[PDB]
């Protein structure tokens, strides 16, 4: 009954589409047509972290909003003191093909991974004075594109084998594997309550997952190309997705739809990174065209450009206190903007 | 300013000094991206992601195998942007065989397609290629048993291995579309020891001399 199953799938997709069309009575643009514009915010670079001798592929702030970890293809994992530009640590990696890194919320650990297919977790706080590998998580058949510490013992990792996994660090075994994507999963974002997380893959589909259950609650489409960056809205009820179709999109969870489209006719390059601000009024996206744009998340109006990098702005991050935004790039420099 | 702050600054200076030392150490060690089968034979000749390190005549090499990576190359080939050279391996015996992995298209068509994609990337514009046209011994018998027309219907039939291998080689460098900027160093892999490694060493030495001239502003 293959034809019957295909017909059921098609009619059920059409039911999805009709239910989404019914609840689209208005638009975020129409409702926000009355709110005053943000203006033209010009952030100035404050620090410039130097010491990487290759492309920077990932950065992650610390929950203290002062320490940040950087991953680069020179095989080093540098822990930075952003206020003083000092180097707290410099972890030498077994493999130099690191594509992602994360900072533990407590600050005790740091993770990284890449084309060696292994998420390596490093103990920053040891009695013998150095940083050592505490665990090598190896169950993925494709390169790790993202990883986020769910707590001090759980980590959720996405890989380019179309699967994300939830790991248990103390045993090194993956509690829950998240299947359903038809393409390589590129990014990953954890909800503030850490009960859900969104993953955007190379199939131009963003899925909303439940960590405890292990199922895809809700699948979001709309992008014309693969999604490289994903980020939750601060209240955990929406998320934005930067892709390769030169367009960022704000999807809603309670409505199951796209709210706004952040596109300009000049920008024809993909989005490497996406993050919100503390209030959610600003959306910062880094592009292949050497810089980072600030978007009005409610008006879809560009409100600034962070033009300070001589290569692709790969990683991007906003502090938990909202004070600064840090952009890394293939030019081997991290800059703190404010 | 404070005592602990000055001590931390000294720690950071030591860290940066070791970083600079490691960077200048790694600057003069040659990276080789191996694509492709013959890859196993080539990597055994000088003997996730496989990095095999060999030393030949006071020079340090690294060879990267990415065969196990069954993902989109567009998502991680920019990582390998910046390598010294690319080693491409082609089985000359795989011209009469079909079904590369499971399809109806024959081999030496998939090989040429992958060669065209790698050779013409936006990333490998200044990156030389070392072609290894392997499987000569099998080719000797295969060209006699069956004509070359099977793989190439538009071929002038002359099956003696003296110029059919030359025809395959000529097509492979004809796939290059940015000549006068990139060089295809082609070699027919002989099983003799200390022969392929010498070819790689000569090609890489030429590439190094080109790069130093470019840094000097001459070439």
């Amino acid at each position: 009954e293959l034809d019957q199953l295909r017909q059921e799938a098609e009619q059920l997709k059409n039911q999805i589409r009709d239910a989404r069309k019914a609840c689209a009575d208005a638009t975020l643009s129409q409702i926000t047509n009355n709110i005053d514009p943000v203006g033209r915010i010009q952030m100035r670079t404050r620090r410039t972290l130097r010491g990487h001798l290759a492309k920077i592929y990932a950065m992650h702030w610390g929950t203290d909003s002062r320490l940040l970890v950087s991953a680069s293809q020179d095989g080093k994992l540098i822990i930075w003191d952003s206020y003083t530009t000092n180097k707290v640590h410099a972890i030498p990696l077994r493999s130099s093909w690191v594509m992602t890194c994360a900072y533990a919320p407590s600050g005790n650990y740091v993770a990284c991974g890449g084309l060696d297919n292994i998420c390596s977790i490093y103990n920053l706080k040891t009695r013998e004075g150095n940083v050592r590998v505490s665990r090598e998580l190896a169950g993925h058949t494709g390169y790790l594109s993202c990883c986020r510490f769910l707590d001090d013992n759980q980590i959720v990792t996405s890989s380019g084998d179309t699967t994300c996994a939830l790991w248990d660090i103390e045993t090194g075994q993956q509690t829950t594997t998240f299947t359903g994507h038809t393409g390589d999963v590129m990014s990953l974002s954890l909800a503030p309550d850490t009960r859900l997380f969104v993953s955007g893959a190379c199939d131009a589909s963003a899925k909303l997952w439940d960590v405890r259950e292990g199922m895809c609650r809700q699948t979001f489409t709309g992008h014309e190309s693969d999604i490289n960056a994903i980020c939750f809205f601060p209240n955990g009820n929406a998320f934005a997705t930067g892709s390769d179709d030169a367009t960022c999109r704000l999807f809603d969870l309670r409505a199951d739809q796209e709210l706004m489209t952040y596109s300009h006719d000049n920008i024809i390059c993909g989005i490497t990174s996406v993050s919100f601000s503390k209030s959610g009024r600003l959306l910062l996206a880094g592009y292949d065209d050497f810089n980072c744009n600030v978007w009005d998340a409610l008006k879809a109006d560009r409100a600034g450009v962070l033009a300070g990098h001589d290569n692709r702005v790969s990683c991007l991050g906003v502090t938990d206190d909202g004070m600064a935004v840090a952009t890394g790039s293939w030019d081997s420099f991290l800059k703190i903007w404010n | 300013v404070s005592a602990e702050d000055k001590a931390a600054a000294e720690r950071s200076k030591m860290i940066d000094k070791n970083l600079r030392e490691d960077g200048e150490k790694a600057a003069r060690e040659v990276k080789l991206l191996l694509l492709g089968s013959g890859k196993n034979t080539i990597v055994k000749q000088m003997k996730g992601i496989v990095e095999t390190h060999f030393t030949f005549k006071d020079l340090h090499f690294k060879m990267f195998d990415v065969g196990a990576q069954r993902s989109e190359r567009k998502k991680w080939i920019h990582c390998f942007e910046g390598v010294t050279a690319i080693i491409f391996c082609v089985a000359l015996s795989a011209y009469d065989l079909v079904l590369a992995e499971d399809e109806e298209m024959n081999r030496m068509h998939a090989s040429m397609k992958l060669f065209d994609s790698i050779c013409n990337n936006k990333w490998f514009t200044d990156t030389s290629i070392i072609l290894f046209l392997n499987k000569k011994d099998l080719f000797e018998e295969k060209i006699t048993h069956s004509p070359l027309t099977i793989c190439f219907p538009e071929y002038t039939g002359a099956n003696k291995y003296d110029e059919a291998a030359s025809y395959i080689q000529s097509k492979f460098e004809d796939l290059n579309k940015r000549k006068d900027t990139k060089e295809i160093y082609t070699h027919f892999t002989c099983s003799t020891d200390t022969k392929n490694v010498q070819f790689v060493f000569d090609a890489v030495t030429d590439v190094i001399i080109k790069n130093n001239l470019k840094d000097c502003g001459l070439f």
Partner: single-chain antibody
Amino acid sequence: VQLVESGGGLVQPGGSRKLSCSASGFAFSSFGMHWVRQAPEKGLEWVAYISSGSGTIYYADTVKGRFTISRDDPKNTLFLQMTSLRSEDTAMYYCVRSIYYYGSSPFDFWGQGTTLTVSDIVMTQATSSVPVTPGESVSISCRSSKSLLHSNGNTYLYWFLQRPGQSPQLLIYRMSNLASGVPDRFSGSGSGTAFTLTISRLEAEDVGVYYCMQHLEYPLTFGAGTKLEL
């Protein structure tokens, strides 16, 4: 971790002796090292400091030209070559490791001690002996002469504990930063000059002598010592 040290003994006045401490477990090269004296019936005094990488070297005014400090990282040893020994140089010498970065815990492990016998911010602890019994709370006070609150929001006052027969143990490195394996009943508070340590649920193993020492300026200064007795 182990910082074992030897080289003490009886020496005539005006002679020369060398002390040596050998590190065992931790990464010796990444730690700065201190020499701290403890006179027979007196408190703790600071002698020298050798920076990680042997960059910066500091001495007390008493031992500036006479004593010298050097380290051998490949051998994992720290030396103290003492010259012109006088009767005030008799003490039990401790080797203290200190790593310095953001959030570090300086002065965390001490050595056993070597007995050598020869034939500035003012840190004050008015109390000299507090009569205590197990069960209730104890507050130990400590005042300074210069405000230890830096412009970077850090107060550089550490806390230490010598039990009747052991080397000092760090309790609170920053104003209120509890050490690694110290029970949560310890705490600290203050603004710039007035400091206090509050043990909440005292027991037998918490009795000893408590010192407060500043890390604001190079001549690190300890206190007289506040003693808790059962």
